[PDB]
Design an enzyme around this catalytic site. Structure first.
Site, short mmCIF file in Angstrom:
data_model
loop_
_atom_site.label_atom_id
_atom_site.label_comp_id
_atom_site.label_asym_id
_atom_site.label_seq_id
_atom_site.Cartn_x
_atom_site.Cartn_y
_atom_site.Cartn_z
N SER A 139 -15.88 0.13 -49.29
CA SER A 139 -14.67 0.15 -50.08
C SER A 139 -13.78 1.26 -49.54
CB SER A 139 -14.96 0.40 -51.55
OG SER A 139 -15.21 1.77 -51.77
N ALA A 147 -9.43 3.02 -50.07
CA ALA A 147 -8.31 3.16 -51.00
C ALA A 147 -7.54 1.83 -51.09
CB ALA A 147 -7.39 4.29 -50.56
N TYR A 148 -7.60 1.05 -50.02
CA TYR A 148 -6.74 -0.13 -49.90
C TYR A 148 -7.47 -1.47 -49.95
CZ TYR A 148 -2.65 2.79 -48.92
OH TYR A 148 -1.61 3.69 -49.03
N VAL A 188 -14.97 -4.51 -48.77
CA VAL A 188 -15.51 -5.53 -47.88
C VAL A 188 -16.87 -6.00 -48.34
CG1 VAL A 188 -16.33 -6.09 -45.54
CG2 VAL A 188 -14.30 -4.57 -45.89
N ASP A 233 -10.47 -2.67 -36.34
CA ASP A 233 -9.67 -1.69 -37.07
C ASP A 233 -9.66 -2.12 -38.54
OD1 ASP A 233 -6.72 -0.46 -37.94
OD2 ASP A 233 -7.74 0.72 -36.41
#
Ligand SMILES: CCCCCCCCO[C@@H]1O[C@H](CO)[C@@H](O)[C@H](O)[C@H]1O
Ligand SMILES: CCCCCCCCO[C@@H]1O[C@H](CO)[C@@H](O)[C@H](O)[C@H]1O
Length: 334
Positions: A28, A30-31, A34, A164
């Site tokens: 996990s 801030a955005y 997964v 990325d």
């Protein structure tokens, strides 16, 4: 439209197409968060990333659009690409969540020399793939900026993809100019990172393991030496030139004892303070160290990438609409 099912993961309701099964939280941020999953439709292990409040603000919304645009663009064996993007929303009015699906290769380079260094033959193969993928990214006029071992995924056959976007499961690999907020970055910021990674694969040890920002810079200067006359001319500040002269040689050669001299020659060409004098990815692919793998007929470049959006200051609803467009137009890879 596929049939979706719902399930509570990472503290929210994930709504995903039935094909994706066995979701298991793996990260996990801030955005986004997964889950690893298995795509019963392709037989692939995948990562499914659910963005967290993708349109919470102008900045979140632009970040969401950028991430999707970049992933949609990447079509290369050594770069992560987008297997799927979806939303359970049936219209722009309902549109609130975005899920991105990518290959899950199964490992990365982050653990890899903890126990022992790699063989020279294996380093040739891994670095070759990193540079093949970087030639592609660079040819699109895109700079990675954060290459590091956890951003390099490998499968069992050690096929490698550059990652990325928080798919990675430190400043040790950062180009010094990035740390010195230089701006006007060159793509060869990424070549510095490759040099740091390659050095660590060959020696089994981090090249510049700084404890903090200034320590990181002091270690770099000790190893590559004070800036020469040509580089000093490109630094405006007299005090800065005085300050670096005060921190400022340990043998580069002594770090790589026993290494293939071709590897050392390439390292010397990557780990150059002056970013204008670092070897490029394309040049590096042609270096004799890679003679076993180099094939100019199969080191492809990218389509040009439309980066106009990067300089735009738009409203959330526009970023959101642009993102929705890109979701709806997605066509899955072959
Ligand atoms: C450990 C070394 C401490 C100081 C590092 C040098 C700081 C350089 O500073 C950079 O110089 C550039 C060229 O003049 C400018 O364009 C950049 O704005 C500036 O950030
Ligand atoms: C370790 C302390 C000194 C660091 C010096 C870093 C110099 C990086 O190199 C600089 O990168 C800039 C940005 O691309 C270019 O504009 C400069 O021409 C180039 O010399």
């Amino acid at each position: 439209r596929p049939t979706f099912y719902r399930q509570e993961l990472n503290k929210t309701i994930w709504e995903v197409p039935e094909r994706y099964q066995n979701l298991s939280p793996v990260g996990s941020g801030a955005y986004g968060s997964v889950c690893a999953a298995f795509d019963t439709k392709t037989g692939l292990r995948v990562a499914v990333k659910k963005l967290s409040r993708p349109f919470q603000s102008i900045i979140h919304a632009k970040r969401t659009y950028r991430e999707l645009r970049l992933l949609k663009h990447m079509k290369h064996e050594n770069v992560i690409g987008l297997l799927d993007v979806f939303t359970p929303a049936r219209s722009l009015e309902e549109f609130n969540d975005v899920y991105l699906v990518t290959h899950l290769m199964g490992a990365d380079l982050n653990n890899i020399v903890k126990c022992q260094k790699l063989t020279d033959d294996h380093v040739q193969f891994l670095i070759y793939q990193i540079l093949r993928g970087l030639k592609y990214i660079h040819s699109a006029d895109i700079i990675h900026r954060d290459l590091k071992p956890s951003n390099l995924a490998v499968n069992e056959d050690c096929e490698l993809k550059i990652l990325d976007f928080g798919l990675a499961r430190t400043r040790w690999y950062r180009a010094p100019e990035i740390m010195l907020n230089w701006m006007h970055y060159n793509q060869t910021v990424d070549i510095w990172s490759v040099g740091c990674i390659m050095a660590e694969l060959l020696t089994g040890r981090t090249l510049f393991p700084g404890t903090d920002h200034i320590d990181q810079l002091k270690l770099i200067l000790r190893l590559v030496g004070t800036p020469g006359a040509e580089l000093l001319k490109k630094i405006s500040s007299e005090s800065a030139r005085n300050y670096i002269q005060s921190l400022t040689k340990m043998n580069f050669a002594n770090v790589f004892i026993g290494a293939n001299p071709l590897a050392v020659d390439l390292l010397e060409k990557m780990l150059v303070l002056d970013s204008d004098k670092r070897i490029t990815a394309a040049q590096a692919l042609a270096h004799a160290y890679f003679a076993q793998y180099h094939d100019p007929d199969d080191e492809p470049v990218a389509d040009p990438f439309d980066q106009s959006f990067e300089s735009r200051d738009l409203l959330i609803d526009e970023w959101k609409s642009l993102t929705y467009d890109e979701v709806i137009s997605f066509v899955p890879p072959p």
